[PDB]
């Protein structure tokens, strides 16, 4: 990327990208090919896993068709189906409700290795600290 022009990003779902009220039409509208979001999308989607959030960019100008750019998963959401609670609080942050794992955060953050700056790959865990102190949740470290 040496010339940004259009990078709309509103996370989607792997098993079936083909919505309508949330995104649907407007997820590829202004010179974009709506059809291609099942031919090219799922060409790197099911490569991994199906069901959960997936941010994304495309590279279409006014060139009709296009190639679909894969992306990372968010690093704080990996504190739900790979951790515990799925909301975030319930009880106002006057009291620190949640609860965290020290084992996890390493390899399960490591999953996001190719989207981070920390040279040391254990540093990258140190980043998931506050990101997973999302409520003030401390780890039985």
């Amino acid at each position: 990327a040496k010339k940004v022009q259009a990078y709309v990003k509103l996370q989607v779902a792997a098993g079936m990208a083909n919505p309508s009220p949330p995104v649907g039409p407007a997820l590829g509208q202004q010179g974009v090919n709506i059809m291609e979001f099942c031919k090219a999308f799922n060409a790197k989607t099911d490569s991994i896993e199906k069901g959960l959030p997936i941010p994304v960019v495309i590279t279409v100008y006014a060139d009709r068709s296009f190639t679909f750019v894969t992306k990372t998963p968010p690093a704080a959401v990996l504190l739900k189906k790979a951790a515990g609670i799925k909301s975030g609080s319930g009880k106002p942050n006057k009291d620190k409700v949640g609860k965290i794992s020290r084992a996890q955060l390493q390899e399960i953050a490591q999953t996001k290795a190719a989207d981070m700056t920390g040279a040391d790959i254990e540093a990258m865990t140190r980043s998931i600290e506050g990101t997973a102190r999302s409520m003030g949740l401390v780890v039985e470290d």
Binding site: P21, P22, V23, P25, A26, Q29
Partner: protein, 66 residues
């Protein structure tokens, strides 16, 4: 919509326009069409039907006096 004492509840993003969803009191939507037109250069449908009865703000209530 907000100015009309109105409550919002969604935005979809319908293709080319943007469906905007709101619950707003009847006694406030009168002559809506005319200003909606002014705000949107004349391109903006809208539609309404009855939904519910909610508390009228005090100033409203005490005014509504027969």
């Amino acid at each position: 919509l907000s100015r009309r004492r109105g409550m919002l509840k969604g935005q979809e993003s319908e293709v080319t326009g943007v469906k905007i969803h709101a619950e707003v009191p009847l006694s406030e939507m009168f002559g809506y069409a005319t200003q909606l037109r002014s705000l949107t250069k004349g391109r903006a449908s809208y539609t309404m039907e009855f939904l519910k009865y909610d508390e009228a703000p005090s100033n409203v209530a005490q005014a509504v006096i027969e």
